[PDB]
Each structure stands twice: as C-alpha cells, then as structure tokens.
Amino acid sequence: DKLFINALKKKFEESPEEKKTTFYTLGGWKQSERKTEFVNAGKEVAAKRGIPQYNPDIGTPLGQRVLMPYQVSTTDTYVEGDDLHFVNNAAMQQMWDDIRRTVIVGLNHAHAVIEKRLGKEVTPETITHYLETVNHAMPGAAVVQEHMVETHPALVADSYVKVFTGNDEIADEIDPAFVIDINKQFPEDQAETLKAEVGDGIWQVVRIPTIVSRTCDGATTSRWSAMQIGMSMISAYKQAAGEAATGDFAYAAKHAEVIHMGTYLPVRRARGENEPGGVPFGYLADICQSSRVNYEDPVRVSLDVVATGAMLYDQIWLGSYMSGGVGFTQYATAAYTDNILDDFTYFGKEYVEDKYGLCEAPNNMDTVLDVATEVTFYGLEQYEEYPALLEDQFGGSQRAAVVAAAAGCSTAFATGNAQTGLSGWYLSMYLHKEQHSRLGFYGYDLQDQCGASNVFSIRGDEGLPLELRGPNYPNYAMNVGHQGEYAGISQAPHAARGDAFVFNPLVKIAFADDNLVFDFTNVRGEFAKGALREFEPAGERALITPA
Amino acid sequence: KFEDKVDLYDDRGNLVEEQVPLEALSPLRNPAIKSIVQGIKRTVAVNLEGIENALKTAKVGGPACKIMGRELDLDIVGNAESIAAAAKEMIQVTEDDDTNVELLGGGKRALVQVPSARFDVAAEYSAAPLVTATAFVQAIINEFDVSMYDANMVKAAVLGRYPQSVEYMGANIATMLDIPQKLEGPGYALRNIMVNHVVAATLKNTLQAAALSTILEQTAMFEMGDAVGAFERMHLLGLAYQGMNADNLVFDLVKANGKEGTVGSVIADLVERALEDGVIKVEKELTDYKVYGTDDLAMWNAYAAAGLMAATMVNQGAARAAQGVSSTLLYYNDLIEFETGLPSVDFGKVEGTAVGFSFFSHSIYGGGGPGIFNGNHIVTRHSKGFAIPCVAAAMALDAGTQMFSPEATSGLIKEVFSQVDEFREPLKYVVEAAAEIKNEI
Amino acid sequence: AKFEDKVDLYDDRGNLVEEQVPLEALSPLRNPAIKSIVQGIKRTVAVNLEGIENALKTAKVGGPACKIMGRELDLDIVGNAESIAAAAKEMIQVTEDDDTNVELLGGGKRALVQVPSARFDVAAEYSAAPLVTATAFVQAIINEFDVSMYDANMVKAAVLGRYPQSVEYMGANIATMLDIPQKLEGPGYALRNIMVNHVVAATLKNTLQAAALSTILEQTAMFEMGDAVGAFERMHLLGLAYQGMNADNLVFDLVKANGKEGTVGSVIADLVERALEDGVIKVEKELTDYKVYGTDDLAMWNAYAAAGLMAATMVNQGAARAAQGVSSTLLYYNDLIEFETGLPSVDFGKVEGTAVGFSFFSHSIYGGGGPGIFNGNHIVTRHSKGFAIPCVAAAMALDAGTQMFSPEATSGLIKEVFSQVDEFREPLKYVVEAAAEIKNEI
Amino acid sequence: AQYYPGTTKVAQNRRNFCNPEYELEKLREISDEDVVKILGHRAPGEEYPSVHPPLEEMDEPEDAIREMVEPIDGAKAGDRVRYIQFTDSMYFAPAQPYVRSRAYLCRYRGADAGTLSGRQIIETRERDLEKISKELLETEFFDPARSGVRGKSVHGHSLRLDEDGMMFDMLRRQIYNKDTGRVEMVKNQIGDELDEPVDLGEPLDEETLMEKTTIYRVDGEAYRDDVEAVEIMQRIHVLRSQGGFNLE
C-alpha cells in the first residue's frame, strides 16, 4: 500500500479514498487536546499579567474541520501540528543551536607559527595538552590571569573542542577523548574518502555554549572560539601572554583557517555569520548525518536532509528570522510527516532504477523531461485518487514542494548531477500549475518562473551549482517550500552515488560527533521526541533561578 | 587656492623639480594620481591555473569545498592565448580603447585592465571583476564548447560562491579593492586596500610603498570629504611631506639617523628643522622648559608627519621587522608632544590609531600582523591618512619575520599588479606630472 | 559596430525623430546622453536648508522622534541661503570654470547641488557627492554665523544625521537618488537601488519619460553588473531600445491600438501579429488547431515581447489609473503570451518570476509595499535584468492618487530638486538626440 | 488568438474562458443590490466613497499615454479600489485560479488579478468591480456549491465535500437548502451576516460540472492525456532553459 495510508486512516474516520465527510459538528477547538491546553494557558497567562492574550473567540473559530494529527515520517509518533512548531519543540531549537554554536578551525597555520615564528616544537603530546587546556577554557574559564571570574561549569556543559585528522597515526597519538574518529563514525569507503580529503591536516570542531548562543547571535561563535583558542595557545605553548605572534594566532583562528556554518548576509536581511540564511544547501546536507548511517537507502538519506532543511529554513529562518508570528510549521511539516514525500520519492527511485539504474542516465534535458514528468504525474495523481491526502496537505504550496522535491531528487538519482535534478524541480512546478490551474501561494513561484532560465545560467548573480546555492541566492531569498527541498536535491545525487559528502567534507565530519545534544543521524526521530516533550535541551537557566 | 610651494625629489634623494605649487600634487589636479586611481579601479588579475585546477578537482565555492562528480578536465592554461584573446573581445568597448589583457607566467595568470569607458557610465568599480569574470567564463565555455549542463562549474571556478556569499568566496580572480558592501563608510573604497597589496605591487621599495600608500589614503580623504574646505590644505601638506618626500625631509632625516639613530633622535632633529624653517617658535618659557607655538598648525603637522615617517624607517629599518611600527606610531607622537607642547600628528589621531594598532597586533582579540591592516580596517581607519603609509614602509623593510606577508595574502597581486609601471613606482610618475602641470595651477 | 541592427527613433508624442540608427548608438557605453544622465545621478544632491534650520531650532536630529533638549540653535539659515550657498560652492568646486552647480530653490528653502565631475574621476564610487556637499554646507553654516566649537557638532547632526553611528545618513537633511554603497544587494547594483518613486518624481509623472529613465538606469546597471557582456549584450540593448526608448514606435503604436477598449490580452494578440509581419517569428509547426511559433532571433523576439509588455502595463494600469495592477500585468502578459505562442516570455520567465513575488509582496503582510517603493536593488524585484522595473515606473506614473506611499510621501525632496535637471526630467529626448548625433560614429 | 493548447474538454473550456468573443453561459439572474450586498464594500444606495478627486476635477499632466488610454468609469470618478475573491473546489468547479486570472486580463480592463491555490482575486475601481462581479456571479464562472465568494478564511479548495456536495466554508457564507435543492448566501464575502439572503440557484449536476470544468484530474480528463498541452509546457521549459544559458 502507499506509505501514507497509515497516517490518513489515523487522521480521519473515512477511508482515504472517500470524497465526502462532515464538518462543523466537531466542537471547534474543543476537539483538540492541544487547543484545550492552549485555551486554559491563555486564561492563566492573561489573568496573571493583566493583559488579554490567547483567546479562541478572537478572529475565526478554528476546528470547523478535523484538526489533524501528524505522523512524523519514519516513526510511529503521531502529534498535533502545534507540537511541531519550533517554539513548542525543544529538539528543533537545539538543532539550530548546535549548528549556530559550531565553528571549524584549523590548527595547521597555528602549528606553523609555533614552529616557524616562535621556534617551538608541536607534537601529539603538545596537541593533547593544548586540547585539555582549551576544553577548560572554551566554556568560559581562565588559564593565565589572577582574579578571573568564570562561567558556571554546569551552565556551559555542552561546550567543548574536538579535533579530527585524516592521518590515522596522528589521530591514534591524540587522547581519544578529544578525537572524532573518522574510522569509527563512517563506513569504510566513506571513511577512506573523508580521510583522503583531510590528509595530514588537523581541524578543531569548536562548540560554544548554547546559553551564550541564545543570549547573543551566530556571529559570536567564531569570535568566542578564537578568544579561547588564543588563550589556550598562549598557555600550552608558553608564549608571552600578548606578544606580536599572539596576533598571528588570532588572525588564523578568526580568518585564515576558520570555516563558518553560514556566511554573513546583505543589508536588507542584515545578519552576521552562522545564521540560517548563510548556510548553503550543500552544508545543510553535510550537517545532516543520515548519509553515514542510511547510506544503503538514498531516499532515506535525501529525505532526512529535506526534513533538516525544511524545519530550519522554513520554520525558524523564513518563519521567524524573516517574518514571525504563527509562522510556517505546516509549510515545513508537509515535507517530513505522514510519509507522503517518502512515498513519492521511493516511487521515483524505483522508476529511475527500473529504467536507467541509479546514476546511469544521461545527464541532459531528455532525462529531466522523462523523470520529472513521470514523478510529478505520480504525485499529483495520489492527491486525486485520495481525497483525504488532498485535505491533509491542503495548501497548494505544500503539494508543490513535496511533488517537485520527489521529481527533483528522482532526476538527480538518475543523472548523478544536482543541476539536472534542479531542472526537474522547476519542470514539475510548470506541469503542476497547468494540471490543476493552481500551484502555491501568491508569491510561491517567483523563483520557479525564474527557475528554468537560471538553472544553467553562468552570469554574475545567476549561475551557481545547486550545492553552492543557499537561502541568500537572489531568487531564493524570500519564500517557503523550496530551501529545505533544495538541500534534499543537493543530497539526492550524492546519496545515489554513495558519496561521503555533498559539498564540504570538514562540515560532514564536524557533526559526526556523539557529544552533540541533537542527534543529527535521526533528525525526524528527534523532531518526534521534541514534539512529545521528551527532549532535554542545553542552555537552560534553571540552575541560577529560584525554585 | 594656496600659495605654498614644495621641492620634489626622487626615491634616491635627488631633486627633480624646484618650487612646485602645492596643488600640483592634489589628487583633484595631478594626472598621475588620476591614472593610478583609475588603474586601481579597472585592473583585475585572473588566475587561469587556479581556475583549471578547481575545475579538475571540482574544488569550488570556498575553503575545503568540493562537489564530487562535477570534475571537468579542461586545458585552460594550454589554451590561455585563445581564451585571453576571446575574453578581451568581450571586455573591450572598441578595438582602439584602453583595454589591456596580458598573459603572465606562461599562461597561468592574466593581467586585465577593463576599459576606462565602462567606468564613465558606472556608479562604482565592480564592473572590473564582474565584466572580467563573465568574459573569461564565456571564453572558456566557448573554447571547449562546455555544455549547458557543466558550464555552471566554470562559473563557480572563476567567481566562487557568489551570490550565495556576499563576497567572491573561493573566486580565482583578484582586485586591490574589495566589494563595496565591506566599506566601513561611504567613500572608503581606496582605503580598503591591504597594506600587503601595496607592498606586493611596489615590490617592497620603501619609499614607493610609502608613496603609493599615501596617494591612496589622502585620495580617499577627498572622496570622504575630509580634505574639503578648512582641512584641504592640511591633507595636501600631509601628502607632500609624509608621502612625497617634499623638500627631501623624510630622506634627510633618515640619512641623519640611519646609522645609529632612534625615534628620540629623529624627534630632536625634526623639531630642530622646524625651528630653523620658521615652522615653530618658542611661545613662552616654564622652569627650564620651553613651550613651542606655531601660526600654521597644518605645516607643523606636516613636518611632524615627515619626522614620523623617518622614525618608522629608522626604527623598523634597524630591526628589519615591521611589528614595531605600531610602537613608533605611538611614542613618536607621545614623545614629541611633551618635547614641544604642541599637538602630535593628526592632533592625536595617529597616536590613538597606534594604541589600538599595537593592541590588535599583539593580542588575542583580532587584527594580526602589520601587513593585513588597511585604511578601511576598524582598527586603523581613525587617522586620516597619516598612519597607514608608515605601516606600508615598515612591512617593506621587513626581512621575512611575518607569517602573513604579501606572499601569504597577496601572491596574485605581487605577480600581476607589480607589472603595471604606475603602480610599481608611483612616486616617479606623480612628481613628473606635478612638474608638467606646475604652471597650470 | 558589433551588431547589425538599426532602429527608428521616436519622441514621447509618437513622432519619428531619426531613421535607421545603429543599435549601439543607444548603448550606455557609447551614448553621450546616457553617460551624462548617469554622471549627473552620481553627482547631484538636494540640500534641505529649511529642514536643517528647523532641526537646529528644535534639536530634532539623529533620526525619527529624536531630540536633544538644551542643544537648540536659532540660526536663520534660509535668510542667509545665498551667502551660505556661495560659500559652500567655493568648497565643493575644484576650479571656477569646472561644472560645479549650486542653485537655490524655493526662495532659499532647498538647494540643488551638483558636485564637479573632476572629483569623481579620482574617486572609486559616488559617495563623494553627498559627503563633499554635506561638509561644505556644514562648514558654510558654521562660518556664516561663527558657530562655536562647542555647538558646531549640532550643525553636523542636522545635515547628515546619525552617521557614523548609523551606517546610513539617518535623519539627514540632504537627499540623493542613489543609496549608500553598503546597501547594494550585490556589486554593480548601485544604479538599481533607485526607488521607482524617485524616477517618477524626477520625470514629474510622465509615463514614457518615466519608462525611459527607468530603462536607462536598469540597463546601464546590467552593463556594470556584467550581465550585458558577450552573448547577452545584444539582448539588453534591444530591450533598452524597444521597451524603454519606444524604438520603431512599437510601444506607442501598441498603446494607440488598445487604449480605447484594450486589455492585456488584446495587446498580446496585436504584438504576436506585429512579430509575424516583421518576420520576427514564424509558424514552426502545427498541433490540433494550435500553431507553435519559433524564431531564429530570441533576442529580437524578447525585445518585441518587452515592448508589448510595456504597452500592456500602460493599457491596463492606464485604464485603471491605479498602479497596483502592474504586478498582475507583468505576470499574466508573460503567462498568456507563452501559451499563446509556444515561445518563452520576456527575460525567459525572469519577468514572470519577479511579477509573482512582486504581486505577493505588494498584497500581503510580509513586506514590500506599494509599487513605488520597489527598485532593481530590492530583493523582491532584482531578478529580471531590466525588463520589469521600467513597467512599474510607467504604472506609478499613471497612478491618479490611489497610493499612500506615492513619490510625494517618500521622494518629495527628489520631486522638487532632481526634476529641475532637464536630462533627468526628459531623458528620452536627450538620449534620442545623442543617438542621432553619433549615428555615423558607431 | 489561440489562448491555450490541447484537445480535451478542459483545454477548450480554458480557451473559451479567455476568448472575449466567447459568450459565457448565463446560469442565473442576480439583482444589482444583491451584488452590492455580496461585495460588502458599501450599502446598496450608499454613495461611492472616493480615494481621490475625479479625473476631470484634476489636471492630469500632458502625457501621450494618458491621452490615448481611456480610463474606466470608476477611475474617472475616483472610486476606491475594492475586490471580489473566489475559491474554486478541485472537485470539478467550472473555473480555477489560473484560468480566472488569465481570463480576467483577456476580458476586463484595468484589472489587478491575483492567483493562489485556495483563492483568486481581482481588485479594480469599485463601480467597475460591481459589473465584473455580476458576470462572475451570473455566468459559468461560478457554481453555488463548488465555488465560493470569500474575502477571508478561504479554506476549502482542497477539502472533501460535505454530505450535500457543498464545498467547506469555515464561515458558512453559502447555505445549501436540503428542502429546496437551492443555495442561499446567508453572509457577505467577508463573513458579515446579510439581512436578506441571496438566492444563488441550484448546484450544477455532476455531469455538467465535468462538461464545464477547467481542472485536469485522473477521474475526469487527465493532464497527462492531453499530450499536446503537456508538450507545449515542456517546450516552454526547454526554451527558457536554453535562453538563460545562451552559450551553445
């Protein structure tokens, strides 16, 4: 049966194929456990603060239809949509905090300064000593001066520094407590690729405290990291506490060998580094760790990336950073609930596998026309054959993103190239718009009408491989239902190929780390856990507040 | 506008032209300065080898970035001549304009000078990288008939992650100017030029590095409006005496103190020269201490600025290590104020720039070595042209004591921009122009 | 000349001016009038002396609702504008015989200030006109009244605002049509960050002149952005000629044929008709009662299509006398013509894409606003490369008073000062004359 | 004009809706007061509020375009710009959102048409809007059960029908009368109660809906079966792609 049949049956009384139902007799918001909780909370909140707040009698009465539960895809967890709002979901907030508070910093230039400029030796022994010093220092504790006041260790317990290197010998020489072991976290072929990319380089994965990231911003991360790297370099390598060479370490840590998660943004959407808009689609695919655990199922890997990106890009970034309010929980949920996108994408994978075999299709428009058209028609036909499914994903934009994501990912499965996958994404929108004489919301296909022409353009602010595109790509800077799906399409070809990474191997390795708070190997499982209020985030101030 | 005249000398201490009107050195009038500035606006270095290796390995879009399966094996350097010729045809406006495209390193790099005509109808300066980038992108695509499906990789190899990034992140082209969005303020573009870029193009010649830096800094002061009205003469006198070795003052001071001298001895000789030349006079006397006063602060500031330059050359010269220039910029000015009772260069702005410059070149918090600073850097933007030219002279005298030298940060600039004569030896071209217009002012 | 196309040049009225002009006589790279307009835009500043005086009288400086009690200064700036303006001109100019212009307006209340070109020949960008003008007038005011060292900083705040604490000249009492370089969406966008309302203000709501100035500015930006280089250069020149310069009278004639009873659809049918007659398109093949059109010159089809798009905006929003529908016209003119012909729409769908989000961000809660506050540098309307914004300018020009944020609300200072420049007010007349005068030098 | 390709009934209906020479079938007669009441911008017999003075009371700038483009009556009068918005059920409503916008700008002057998945809107001068609204309400543009007039809370285009075949309406502006088989509009498009409901006629038969609908569906006419219509969309996609690269 269709992978979404289970969710549809647990959502409505009727069989999924039925064309009629009954409305208006459900009791409005009283049908819902969550809306009832909200009504009582609003009553207590308004009374306590002396200002009216949540009131179900304001505006129009929710719940004239069924207020649906949602299955989180690849799970058996069913929750009301409010439980997948990022404000109500600590797992979603922690996912972004774990990215925002992460920076990658090389040690290669630094070690060259130590040996060439200072004339001291760097060894695995000194590196371990430095790493023990920096893990004391990074959460906010002192190593050089007298009478320093520091951060409470329990408030910053999630902050630390690890390293990785492609040289297995050097990796074995360093205390394993500080090492992300590439051999232990990746399958053999992927580990060999990643280690060859890194070579003899040594790279730090720095995570600053969630409590600081939440107090401040993403541009804080690389600065905070650089200060404590600098202080630990002074301490472990016995240089003067502030001499000329000290500046070389700061420049290298803040500019010369730093890798931000996101680049800064232009003025209209003014934002510093390490904000969602600066994270390119290729990075997001590599931050998601599905690739190293689900590598035998390219659909699962690709769609875990879609879920990662849909939540971050649509709910937190576009739905709050760039707007706010109720936001777009549903715009994103469509791409990771009820197993709907999974059904469409597994069909496309199967169709490509029967006709071409993964990655064996010609990388041209012929393949785009074939695969994207077939998968688009499959997806739209499900909405026609199942009325429940159409009522489930009631927003045209929701259906557009889900159908085109399957079409795009499928095309990339066939060609092994993300750019033809992107062409298939846009072809799906054109067919979709013509089949149903509708597509998405008022401004959903701005990028989609620019789409075809700009897929293969080479001009200044038009041409770019999809992996390098991101939320700041001009056409993409505004609208829901694309960015997270683009991260999936970026992952799509690499997952079919078995690639260990999409765009940056250092980013891939930097999140293969068991000391992260959010488990990036099972993004959708984590979302379900947050929805059930079973996720424990970092950064809480309970320790320093009254009972 | 002004009645001041100066004697112009060359980088070997020889008089070139006597009694030149001050405004003959003004960026607003001097044709050589115009030539250097427009050259700086329109010149681009294209790294054909880098583009080719990026495509070969699919390493595009920034540090440690790669798209497996996108690799393209194009012999770009092998066909550099045809590619460069095809690009020039697109870059140029007409066959007879001032477009220049010249291959370097056997085809590995290309020097590109976008025609001046494109900038007469442009708002700013980004046409140089952008017109060059698309021209070389299109020429490469046409040379090998790159397919619609693969061409976007040529674009990433040339211009990087732009426009997802605001910058040309991972690009294989270079300019001495940075993108306009990074200006600390409007009018700062000629200040956001790394000192290392200046030292690379002048190939470490100290006085040419000092001259080029002063030309750029003081020209920025005009675009920023600082050298307008009441302050115009102050900046021209500063350009002439600190950056143009007017009256051979910097050269003579360095001659008199180069063997055994220090910052303090340079100070004592400068105050002596100022007394002899009527720049300052004893205004009043305290107990065994004379307080100096002067009726032309602008000229005193200029004299003090020449002494500041010579002290950097004597102090950092003796060390052959640039780092101490931040110390010289500070205590030359600190000392001279309590030596004289008169304000230091730029009325304390140089000393302040030097305090933070010292801090941010010897601390954990930011900055770096002297070569990575510039007039647009938040650390070193505060003095209006009187500090950075000294840093340029210091990095020029460095003997390889810095990790982030021009070879580390400005290798492409060193190879390409040093090949343009006006950029390599600016002091010579500017003096000839001033003398040539001396009677048109 | 690189290209072989020639065009017939028409005036705003619809009269032939010069026949068979090489296309590149209209190129920003060659046309002396465009060079003059672009350099004028770079160097012109409006100074609000009355505003400066009122700010000082009340200490209301540094941004909205901002005031420093106790800093008040009562200076009669408007009463002494002539002396102040003359003193400032002496600082702004390079020589007595150069092209500096300082002209008082409104009895001394405003001052048109045109900084000399010499200053920009040795400048990287354009911030010289606002910065040199600001300091010149600050110093002139201080010298006019011998304002003391202790109070002069208030004169600086009254003129240029909270800069440099703010990145912009927040609360400044000067104005330019260009915004500061840090606000560019990308390098080479400066000529695109000019509000549509600024263009409509400068052209005094003249439909064809507003279209021309906007097209001139947009397509010149395409050259600075490198978009109009190599394979794409001809496309952008033909777009400039036919959509913004009323080349061959195509825009004018299309509006004439549909102004009385016409709609977007009827304009489409006549444009498709004209293309066939001029050999721009031909029937490529036939389907069941449907004709698929093809073309051997996409750039020329696109230009013909760009002309019809402009004519449809003028017909549709003209009939309504309300600019808001231009976002609809930019969308469905292109949507309709593609399924009418089987050929790609203007800018290969880029105009349609811009219209989609433009419609959304001019009819929703999330941002944007009325058509007049958009521009080529706006994230909403930057995507089409010159073929959309000139239509928004034409639509706002036809607006009879349905917009809260009209040029009078957001560009009044531009409307008073920049409109006094003949080249900015009637660019089409100057560009056409210049094209004719270089027709045989191209 | 060809308007649209294809050999299905849908394609033809889409062509008919755009073709100004095609006479839309009048399926019901609506009074002028009922249109004003449904619109809800003013009371029947209430003066037209003005957004700006009449054009003849104003002195428009001499402008060849202004002189050649005749303004619509509402613009001459200075009327406000108001709207009428429709939701179209994906279960075979005659008109669909893209069909409307395309048809509006082929048929009506001075039209600001907006297309969305669950709503389609036109804004124009108030008095002109009322005559457009009469045609949109009286002709085959509209079915009282599968289409609804909704200024807000438009949810329903993608929902299952109720037992009566009516489209979902959070505010229930259109009430099906099971005793009479006809539909009445109890409230205005914004949801405000009407004093006297407006008869909207009988819903169309399932067979007539498929005869007139402009949506492709597998259980009607599938888009994938209109091969020539799909072929033109693919052609547009390919030509767009080639134009944006333009370096073959």
Ligand code: F43
């Ligand atoms: C290593 C530096 C160089 C640098 O760039 N910053 C340092 C160190 C840095 C570290 C020291 C943390 C640690 O001990 O691990 C921090 C806390 C910044 C950070 N990374 O979090 C800091 N200083 Ni410092 N630093 C301070 C200060 C100072 C004073 C201390 C003078 C004295 O006699 O004790 C002097 C500067 C001076 O002489 O004026 C100083 C210099 C120095 N400061 C010298 C180390 C001096 C030494 O060897 O002891 N700091 C202060 O003057 C008071 C505030 C204090 C800061 C912590 C706080 O604000 O609570 C701290 C601010």
Ligand code: F43
């Ligand atoms: C008021 C707007 C105009 C606007 O700028 N945004 C709105 C409303 C805005 C509000 C609605 C909150 C509220 O009800 O108070 C929010 C939640 C954004 C916010 N401010 O937090 C939102 N929409 Ni809207 N909006 C949505 C959608 C939609 C779909 C709904 C179609 C349908 O048949 O129901 C349509 C566009 C379309 O037709 O394609 C739509 C339009 C509209 N959307 C129309 C209102 C339509 C109406 O009268 O009911 N949204 C969707 O398509 C699904 C996602 C959903 C968003 C909430 C979420 O993601 O969970 C919400 C996203």
Ligand SMILES: C[C@@H](OP(=O)(O)O)[C@H](NC(=O)CCCCCCS)C(=O)O
């Ligand atoms: C100078 C500059 O550093 P960079 O030169 O850009 O590395 C700047 N830092 C600072 O100003 C550090 C300020 C806080 C630490 C010192 C306080 S005395 C910054 O991060 O942008």
Ligand SMILES: C[C@@H](OP(=O)(O)O)[C@H](NC(=O)CCCCCCS)C(=O)O
């Ligand atoms: C357009 C622009 O708004 P302004 O026109 O600058 O107000 C921009 N907003 C957005 O892009 C909103 C994006 C998220 C909400 C809509 C999602 S479909 C911004 O705030 O910078």
Ligand SMILES: O=S(=O)(O)CCS
């Ligand atoms: O109705 S709109 O498309 O503007 C809102 C979409 S969330």
Ligand SMILES: [Cl-]
């Ligand atoms: Cl002076």
Ligand SMILES: [Cl-]
């Ligand atoms: Cl004219």
Ligand SMILES: [K+]
């Ligand atoms: K409610």
Ligand SMILES: [K+]
């Ligand atoms: K300690």
Ligand SMILES: [K+]
């Ligand atoms: K925060």
Ligand SMILES: [K+]
């Ligand atoms: K076209």
Ligand SMILES: [Mg+2]
């Ligand atoms: Mg039933």
Ligand SMILES: [Mg+2]
């Ligand atoms: Mg079944």
Ligand SMILES: [Mg+2]
């Ligand atoms: Mg902003």
Ligand SMILES: [Mg+2]
């Ligand atoms: Mg088979």
Ligand SMILES: [Mg+2]
């Ligand atoms: Mg020499």
